């Protein structure tokens, strides 16, 4: 069962420090080219650091001097000490095994998300959007919630026809903003009642609102 | 410094056709130093072919790489519905030790559909908070390319608009877009009619919806 | 000086095996490849294979795969060629060519220094002594000998124990249908000297030690 | 200066038709000859003639008991790893120079000699190794690299790999991927009579 | 494999003339071609390597050129020591030689001298008869000897041998041996040799009677 499991990622403040780990099974880290590759949210892959089996370490220009890749031979774990973190360091970090000309990067970890921002945990503040008067569209706008994972359910999780949940965007402040919309027949808009449930698990908030013109 | 450039930013084509992705290395490198990766959304990358021609273990005969020097290609002969992802070409061995391409996205091609346009005035509770947000809901248009212009009056505006676009629909293969215009309470009361102009391939002329 | 001293001529029988050595001197033996080339009598050159004296590795032509084995002995700095299943088509001159030491291309194949050559004759005919016959007519007349039915090669034909070397034409030997070689040598002599001088031809066949000093008389 | 009239065999080192691979680099002991390094330094063919611990214009004065000429072929991009204190696949697993190095590192482009149009795969390097090479150490073993928990048992499988990879040298490659012939001269100074000397007459 | 073709399989040129031969290749072998010279009875000598470079110790009159598929070997001024067979070898693959080009010295046409030697009594007693036709000091090598017995064109029993070109007068010599059994030899009366050489206006016939 060859696998690579990352851990240690999570919320951190700008200028802080954070250490990632990558436990390996059936792959001996001390005998392999093991590298870290990060993917900025919505952006492409970017190589971060690489360690040789002999112990040579190589870093990307953007992370040179701040990052440090190491390993624990006894624990079969690969590390990445990330220091002086900036807002541009937010990404999903993958630990990977490199074979270069003998097979390239065959094995990747599941990835761990590292979020670097000064915003504190904050519950969502949803606001229904009036239909404003066929096939009238209605929805509720979720605004000013920092922790990204938010699930929106329409009518107690009993509506999937035209239910669209747009991905959250990082606005000028550290908080995020999400919008959910649904398409409903104009005749049914007046009679039927539609509500949306926003469940913010990290913030323990379940604000529910009713949308009616 | 090795720089990899992938010529097609987005390669739109129907399932069953043949996809030909391309990578262009800045300088002529040995053929054994280039690999191709596939990343489905929310997943780690999966190596497809290494050494520019050598298929990875478990990769079906459908995927095939070729090319040498400064021009490499990846060929997907019979595009299955699960082959539509982002493809990166990687160069390894030189300085920097590992380089990645910007990625080529494959999307399902279908008939061009006009975007159903909606506009939503901000709620009273939203206004009471001091900030006003007005959104343009674009529904079920296939060509992702769609420019939306925001203007609080007859004069155009920029620098205060953020837009969200959903992934390609699992059934309709159409994108939905929502551009939000953030305005202060003072700014919202400084104008009367707010218009939303959108230009799209499916529209013969741009369609604008406004409110008082 | 660089030299590749080869083993002597070998007369073999069909189906047998022949071993040809090549004594390298004047250069470091484990420095370049040793190529083996052969030339059928009157045909062109044909490359057979090379052996790396350092590694011991070899590579052969697709037509010589399974019939040629190449071995080297670094102590005496001698390369060996062993050819098995000798058919009648394996009669040739087997050259031992050293590769190129300085300059050129690393992947290239060069034959810089060539051995003297080792003639290998493969036929079922047994060793036989020559049968020397005179050649007489019936303006300068001509007369000669008709060395015939001898095996193997070569046969040396002289005149008057080397005294006569002007006008002597010793032709190449031709292999007739019986596997025996036939040879004719002639010399031009003035017609006035037919009744005054008598000319003899000296046939010296090294194998079988047969020596004939038949003398040609104009009848 | 000792009475020696022989000329040091630099022609057979810099002009050999075939060079060694970097993992199996060829060491030549040069002794009992008069070495003239000024024509080497003043030759314009060499792209790299770095000298550590000595000076190229001073080399014609010192006398060394032994000179070692290590010759091998690497890529253009890996000539930067033939300096003391460097890191990389060549400086860690193929050819290591000590940080106390005294001698010259000479390299020149050999794209006209080592590059074949279809590809020259005669030159190899060690891709996989467990530990860094000690200075002036040569590792020519071809045992299958483990890289995993399961023993190799001499069979190349999933995690078991052949340690040596091959350079793909073609004349159309970039200048950083083209072959470079490297000659590393190590100047040994022991408590023995000097044999390799400059061409000064006295 | 790779096939090497040398168009002038045999070429005559006087001393002091420019000589040119070609080594058209089967494929594109770049400049991976060597040129060898084999003197009569000696091992081949390397003259040109890499299709242009002159081997050390080789006279400067030799020169080679060409690349890709067609190659050229040139002697600026033919000299008497340049007579031999010239082979071209490729090393784009396992080494392969050309057919060879035989160089002969050109000179004025010389008529052949024809002599007939009837079989000796000793050979007749042995059991076989051989009649040999001698062609002495003729040029060019192209001579046709036909053995005629009682005005019948005998064939399938004659073997010819040609000497190499003489180093003094640059001329050849041909001997044709007609092998016949004792019974067949005694079954006829007159044996004749006919030679058709360009040095004679009409063929000359030298014959003899079985008796005398």
Q: Residue B6 carries which DSSP code?
A: -
Q: Using CA coordinates, name the residue in chain D closest to E29.
A: D117
Q: Taking CB atoms and an 8 Å cutoff, what residues of chain C touch D19?
A: 106
C112 and C64, same structural domain? yes
E151 and E96, same structural domain? no
Name the burial class of residue E96, with classes exposed (0-12), middle (13-18) and buried (19+) by CB atoms within 10 angstroms of its CB: buried
Number of Cβ within a 10 Å radius of residue D42:
11
- Its domain, for residue A16, covers 3-116
Q: Taking CB atoms and an 8 Å cutoff, what residues of chain B touch D170?
A: 30
A134 and A109, same structural domain? no
Q: Neighbours of B (≥3 Cβ pairs closer than 8 A)?
A: A, D
**CA dist C73 → A165, C24, C31, C111, C178 (Å):** 80, 11, 14, 20, 40
Find the CATH number of the domain harbouring C22: 2.60.40.10
Distance from CA of D195 to the nearest CA of B (A): 41
Q: Which of the residues D17, D26, D72, D116 would you substitute to probe the C interface, choosing the one with the greatest number of C C-beta atoms within 10 Å?
A: D17
Strands (E) located in A67-160 = 67-72, 77-83, 91-98, 105-108, 112-116, 125-129, 137-145, 151-154
Asked how this structure was determined, the answer is cryo-EM
A88 and A26, same structural domain? yes
Strands (E) located in D12-146 = 26-30, 48-52, 63-64, 66-75, 103-109, 124-126
Q: Which of E70, E88, E92, E86 lies closest to E25 in space, CA to CA? A: E70
Report the residue from D167, D170, D174 with minimal CB separation from B27. Answer: D174
Inter-chain residue contact D177 with B69, CB threshold 8 Å: no
In a domain, C127, yes or no: no
B127 and B101, same structural domain? no
C100 and C150, same structural domain? no
CA dihedral D170, D171, D172, D178 (to 10 degrees): 70
The whole-angstrom separation of Cα A159 and Cα A79 is 45
Q: Using CA coordinates, name the residue in chain D closest to B26.
A: D174
The whole-angstrom separation of Cα D78 and Cα A76 is 30
C151 and C111, same structural domain? no
Distance from CA of E86 to the nearest CA of D (A): 24
Inter-chain residue contact D174 with B31, CB threshold 8 Å: no
**CA dist E56 → C28, E62, E90, E142, E175 (Å):** 20, 12, 20, 37, 41
A88 and A134, same structural domain? no
A86 and A150, same structural domain? no
**CA dist A108 → B51, B84, B102, E72 (Å):** 18, 20, 19, 57
Which uninterrupted H or E stretch holds A191? helix A186-191
The verdict on E85 touching C (C-beta cutoff 8 Å) is: yes
Count contacts between B and D (CB, < 8 Å): 26
B201 and B131, same structural domain? yes
The verdict on E94 touching C (C-beta cutoff 8 Å) is: yes
For chain B, the domain total comes to 2
Q: Which of residues 154-173 of A touch B (CB under 8 A)?
A: 162, 164-169, 171-172
Tell me the DSSP string of chain E: ---B--S-SEEEE-TT--EEEE--BSS--TT-EEEEEE-TTS--EEEEETTTEEPTTS-TTEEEEEETTEEEEEESS--GGG-SEEEEEE-SSS-EE---EEEEE----BPPEEEEEPPPHHHHHHTEEEEEEEEEEEBSS-EEEEEEETTEEE-SSEEEEEPPPPTTT--EEEEEEEEEEHHHHHT-SEEEEEEEETTSSS-EEEEEES--
A142 and A101, same structural domain? no
A7 and A88, same structural domain? yes
C204 and C139, same structural domain? yes
A108 and A11, same structural domain? yes
Report the residue from D131, D147, D165 with minimal CB separation from A54. Answer: D131
- Residue E160 forms beta bridges with which residues? E176
C94 and C28, same structural domain? yes
For chain C, the domain total comes to 2
Alpha helices in D103-176 (DSSP H): 111-114
C83 and C34, same structural domain? yes
Distance from CA of D15 to the nearest CA of C (A): 5
Q: Of A116, A136, A157, which residue is a domain's last?
A: A116
Radius of gyration for chain C, computed over Cα atoms and rounded to the nearest angstrom:
22
C118 and C141, same structural domain? no
Number of Cβ within a 10 Å radius of residue E81:
9
B92 and B30, same structural domain? yes
Give Cβ neighbours of residue B193 (< 8 Å, ≥ 6 apart): B153, B210, B211, B212
E55 and E39, same structural domain? yes
Inter-chain residue contact D174 with B28, CB threshold 8 Å: yes
A106 and A16, same structural domain? yes
Find the CATH number of the domain harbouring A21: 2.60.40.10
- Its domain, for residue B196, covers 116-211
Q: Of E105, E129, E161, which residue is a domain's last?
A: E105
B69 and B22, same structural domain? yes
Distance from CA of E3 to the nearest CA of C (A): 12
E202 and E138, same structural domain? yes
Which uninterrupted H or E stretch holds B139? strand B131-141
Dihedral of alpha carbons A118, A124, A130, A131, sign: positive
Distance from CA of A43 to the nearest CA of D (A): 30
Find the CATH number of the domain harbouring E86: 2.60.40.10
Q: Taking CB atoms and an 8 Å cutoff, what residues of chain D touch E30?
A: 117
Q: Taking CB atoms and an 8 Å cutoff, what residues of chain A touch D131?
A: 53-54
B121 and B99, same structural domain? no
Q: Taking CB atoms and an 8 Å cutoff, what residues of chain C touch D17?
A: 32, 99-106, 108, 110
Dihedral of alpha carbons A70, A71, A72, A75, sign: positive
Count contacts between C and E (CB, < 8 Å): 130
E128 and E91, same structural domain? no
Number of Cβ within a 10 Å radius of residue E58:
16
Inter-chain residue contact D18 with C106, CB threshold 8 Å: yes
Tell me the DSSP string of chain C: --EEEE---EEE-TT--EEEEEEEESS-GGGS-EEEEEE-TTS-EEEEEEE-TTT--EEE-TTSTTTEEEEEETTTTEEEEEE-S--GGG-EEEEEEE---BSS-TT-----EE---EEEEE-SPPPB--B--EE----EEEEEE--BSBBSS-EEEEEGGGT--SSEEEPPPEE-TTS-EE--EEEEEEGGGTTT--EEEEEEETGGGEEE--EE---
Number of Cβ within a 10 Å radius of residue A5:
14
A142 and A96, same structural domain? no
Inter-chain residue contact C106 with D122, CB threshold 8 Å: yes
The whole-angstrom separation of Cα B68 and Cα B25 is 10
Q: Which of the residues A2, A49, A166 would you substitute to probe the B interface, choosing the one with the greatest number of B C-beta atoms within 10 Å?
A: A166
In a domain, C32, yes or no: yes
Q: Which of residues 6-65 of E touch C (CB under 8 A)?
A: 32, 34, 36, 38, 43-46, 49-50, 53
Structure tokens that stand for D163 in this block:
């340690």
In a domain, C144, yes or no: yes
- Judging contact as 3 or more Cβ pairs under 8 Å, the answer for A and B is yes
E167 and E129, same structural domain? yes
Q: Of C90, C122, C154, which residue is a domain's last?
A: C122
Q: Of A116, A150, A170, which residue is a domain's last?
A: A116
Count contacts between A and D (CB, < 8 Å): 49
The whole-angstrom separation of Cα D196 and Cα D32 is 6
A111 and A129, same structural domain? no
The domains of chain D, with CATH numbers, are 11-197 (3.30.70.1840)
Inter-chain residue contact A167 with B123, CB threshold 8 Å: no
Q: Taking CB atoms and an 8 Å cutoff, what residues of chain B touch D91?
A: none
Distance from CA of B92 to the nearest CA of D (A): 12
For chain A, the domain total comes to 2
Inter-chain residue contact C111 with E100, CB threshold 8 Å: no
In a domain, C47, yes or no: yes
Structure tokens that stand for D195 in this block:
């044999």
On whether the CB atoms of residues D54 and D102 are closer than 8 A, the answer is yes
Q: Taking CB atoms and an 8 Å cutoff, what residues of chain B touch D173?
A: 28-30, 69
Inter-chain residue contact A129 with B180, CB threshold 8 Å: no
Q: Which of C215, C198, C205 lies closest to C152 in space, CA to CA? A: C205
Q: Which of E54, E206, E10 lies closest to E118 in space, CA to CA? A: E206
Q: Which of the residues D110, D113, D117 would you substitute to probe the E interface, choosing the one with the greatest number of E C-beta atoms within 10 Å?
A: D117
A82 and A132, same structural domain? no
E122 and E200, same structural domain? yes
B194 and B123, same structural domain? yes
The torsion angles phi and psi of A189, rounded to 5 degrees, stand at -65, -45
Q: Of A116, A143, A173, which residue is a domain's last?
A: A116
The whole-angstrom separation of Cα B31 and Cα B53 is 8
Distance from CA of D129 to the nearest CA of A (A): 7
Q: Taking CB atoms and an 8 Å cutoff, what residues of chain D touch A54?
A: 92-93, 129-132
- Its domain, for residue C195, covers 134-216
């Amino acid at each position: 069962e060859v696998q690579l499991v990352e851990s240690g990622g999570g919320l951190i403040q700008p200028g802080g420090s954070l250490r990632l780990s990558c436990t390996a099974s059936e792959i001996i880290v001390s005998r392999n080219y093991m590298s870290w590759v990060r993917q900025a949210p919505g952006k492409g892959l970017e190589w971060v650091s690489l360690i040789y089996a002999g112990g040579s370490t190589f870093y990307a220009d953007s992370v040179k001097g701040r990052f440090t890749i190491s390993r624990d031979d006894s624990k079969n774990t690969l590390y990445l000490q990330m220091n002086s973190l900036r807002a541009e360091d937010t990404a999903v970090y993958y630990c990977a095994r490199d074979l270069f000309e003998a097979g390239a990067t065959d094995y990747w970890g599941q990835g761990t998300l590292v979020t670097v921002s000064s915003a504190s945990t904050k519950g969502p503040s949803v606001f229904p959007l009036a239909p404003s008067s066929g096939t009238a569209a209605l929805g509720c706008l979720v605004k000013d919630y920092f922790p990204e994972p938010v699930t929106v359910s329409w009518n107690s999780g009993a509506l999937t026809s035209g239910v669209h949940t747009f991905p959250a965007v990082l606005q000028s402040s550290g908080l995020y903003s999400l919008s959910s919309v649904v398409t409903v027949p104009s005749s049914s808009l007046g009679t039927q009642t539609y509500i949306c449930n926003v469940n913010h698990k990290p913030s323990n908030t379940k604000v529910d609102k009713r949308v009616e013109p | 410094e090795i720089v990899l450039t992938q010529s097609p930013g987005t390669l739109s084509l129907s399932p069953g056709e043949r996809a030909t992705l391309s990578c262009r290395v800045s300088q002529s490198v040995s053929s054994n130093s280039l690999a191709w990766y596939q990343q489905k959304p929310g997943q780690p990358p999966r190596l497809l072919i290494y050494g520019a021609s050598s298929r990875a273990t478990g990769i079906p005969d459908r995927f095939s790489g070729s090319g040498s020097g400064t021009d490499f290609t990846l060929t997907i002969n019979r595009l299955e519905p699960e082959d539509f992802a982002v493809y990166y070409c990687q160069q390894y061995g030189s300085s920097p030790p590992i380089t990645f391409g910007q990625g080529t996205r494959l999307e399902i091609k279908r008939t061009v559909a006009a975007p159903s346009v909606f506009i939503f005035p901000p709620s009273d509770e939203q206004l009471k908070s001091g900030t006003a947000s007005v959104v343009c809901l674009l529904n079920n248009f296939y060509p992702r390319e769609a420019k939306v212009q925001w203007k609080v009056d007859n004069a155009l505006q920029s620098g205060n608009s953020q837009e969200s676009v959903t992934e390609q629909d699992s059934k309709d293969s159409t994108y939905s877009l929502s551009s939000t215009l953030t305005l202060s309470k003072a700014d919202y009361e400084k104008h009367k009619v707010y218009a939303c102009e959108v230009t799209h391939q499916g529209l013969s002329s741009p369609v604008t919806k406004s409110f008082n | 000086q660089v030299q590749l001293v080869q083993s002597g001529a070998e007369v073999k029988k069909p189906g047998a095996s022949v071993k040809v050595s090549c004594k390298a001197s004047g250069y470091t033996f484990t420095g370049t490849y040793i190529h083996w080339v052969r030339q059928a009598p009157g045909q062109g050159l044909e490359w057979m294979g090379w052996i790396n004296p350092n590694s011991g590795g070899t590579n052969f032509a697709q037509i010589f795969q399974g019939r040629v084995t190449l071995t080297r002995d670094t102590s005496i700095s001698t390369a060996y060629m062993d050819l098995n299943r000798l058919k009648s088509d394996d009669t040739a001159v087997y050259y031992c060519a050293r590769d190129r030491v300085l300059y050129g291309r690393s992947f290239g194949w060069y034959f810089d220094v060539w051995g003297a050559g080792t003639t290998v004759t493969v036929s079922s005919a047994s060793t036989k002594g020559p049968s020397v016959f005179p050649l007489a007519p019936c303006s300068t007349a001509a007369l000669g000998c008709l060395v015939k039915d001898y095996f193997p090669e070569p046969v040396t034909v002289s005149w008057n124990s080397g005294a006569l070397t002007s006008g002597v034409h010793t032709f190449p030997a031709v292999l007739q249908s019986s596997g025996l070689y036939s040879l004719s040598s002639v010399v031009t002599v003035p017609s006035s000297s037919l009744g005054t001088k008598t000319y003899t031809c000296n046939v010296d066949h090294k194998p079988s030690n047969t020596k004939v000093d038949k003398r040609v008389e104009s009848k | 200066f000792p009475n020696i009239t022989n000329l040091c065999p630099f022609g057979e080192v810099f002009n050999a038709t075939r060079f060694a691979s970097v993992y199996a680099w060829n060491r030549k002991r040069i002794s009992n000859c008069v070495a003239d390094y000024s024509v080497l330094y003043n030759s314009a063919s060499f792209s790299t003639f770095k000298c550590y611990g000595v000076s190229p214009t001073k080399l014609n004065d010192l006398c060394f008991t032994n000179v070692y000429a290590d010759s091998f072929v690497i890529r253009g991009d890996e000539v930067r790893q033939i300096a003391p204190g460097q890191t990389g696949k060549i400086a860690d697993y193929n050819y290591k120079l000590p940080d106390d190095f005294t001698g010259c590192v000479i390299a020149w482009n050999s794209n006209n000699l080592d590059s074949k149009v279809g590809g020259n795969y005669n030159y190899l390097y060690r891709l996989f190794r467990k530990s860094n090479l000690k200075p002036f150490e040569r590792d020519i073993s071809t045992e299958i690299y483990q890289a995993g928990s399961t023993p190799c048992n001499g069979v190349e499988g999933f995690n078991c790999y052949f340690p040596l990879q091959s350079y793909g040298f073609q004349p159309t490659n970039g200048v950083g991927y083209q072959p470079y012939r490297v000659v590393v001269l190590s100047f040994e100074l022991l408590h023995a009579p000097a044999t390799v000397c400059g061409p000064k007459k006295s």
